[PDB]
Design a binder for this molecule. Structure first.
Ligand SMILES: CCCCCCCCCCCCCCSCC(=O)O
Length: 268
């Protein structure tokens, strides 16, 4: 007559495998090097080749095509929009989330999605580049740094986060619970039922703590390491939103998708 925390951890893991198109095992298989291998984007020639195959509509406009950096930023946004959709369905697996008022579900997703995006991005990153386009491209870290300002400033802080996050050697069973804990933060601005959310947070963090104790017996400070990573992600998102606002004010061609504009509105 007790909560079965091991079963809850497995439920969360299975919901993560079901709802995210990319998982760390899938990513590692691709990154390791037989059908539809990723096209390597390391310079402008290879960017433009990859676009013609993978996002043909975006480059079908002739001299009306947007600048390379703006096309890349558009693809960044499309990736976020898709991951927002996956996170919204995943959150239904978190005990108590679907019982919250709709407005509180919206608030938790509003503040949590980018922290979750950057945590999970680590799974497709290595020190040399990252998988993109549903695992069909590999874009190099050096190519992204070569873009004109301000677009070269988007990804590098995310690689820096990811290299340290990946050194923790989490697997999908850990990351799924970490993402659920990100979503269940009771201190988000504007929440109505803080008390119930705090209890939901306490429950999922308890599951996470017990799971890490079992799955990582070698790293006795893994749970507090991950609490700190959650705080680091909040700062990474605040900084990312500031850069996006610079782009919005100064780059007239870099249209911001309406779903992401709403996420950013009144965020920080
Ligand atoms: C041809 C393929 C080119 C692909 C270009 C790279 C795609 C990067 C995906 C990660 C996006 C990071 C999202 C943060 S930037 C946009 C946002 O704020 O949502």
């Amino acid at each position: 007559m007790t909560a079965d925390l091991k079963s809850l951890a497995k439920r969360i893991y299975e919901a993560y495998l079901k709802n995210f198109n990319m998982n760390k095992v899938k990513a590692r298989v691709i990154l390791s090097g037989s059908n539809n291998p990723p096209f390597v984007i390391h310079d402008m020639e290879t960017l433009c080749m990859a676009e013609k195959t993978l996002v043909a509509k975006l480059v079908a406009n002739g001299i009306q095509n947007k600048e390379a950096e703006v096309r890349i930023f558009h693809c960044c946004q499309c990736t976020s929009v898709e991951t927002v959709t996956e996170l919204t369905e995943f959150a239904k697996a978190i005990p108590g989330f679907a019982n919250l008022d709709l407005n509180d579900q919206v608030t938790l997703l509003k503040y949590g999605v980018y922290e979750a995006i950057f945590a999970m991005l680590s799974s497709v990153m290595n020190k040399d580049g990252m998988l993109v386009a549903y695992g069909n491209g590999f874009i190099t870290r050096e190519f992204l740094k070569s873009l004109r300002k301000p677009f070269c400033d988007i990804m590098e802080p995310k690689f820096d986060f990811a290299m340290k996050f990946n050194a923790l050697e989490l697997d999908d069973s850990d990351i799924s619970l970490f993402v659920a804990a990100i979503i269940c933060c009771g201190d988000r601005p504007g929440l109505l039922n803080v008390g119930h959310i705090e209890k939901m947070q306490e429950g999922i963090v308890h599951v996470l703590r017990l799971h890490l104790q079992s799955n990582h017996p070698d790293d006795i400070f893994l749970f507090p390491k991950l609490l700190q990573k959650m705080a680091d992600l909040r700062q990474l998102v605040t900084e990312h939103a500031q850069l996006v606002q610079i782009i919005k004010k100064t780059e007239s061609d870099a249209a911001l998708h309406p779903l992401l504009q709403e996420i950013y509105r009144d965020m920080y």
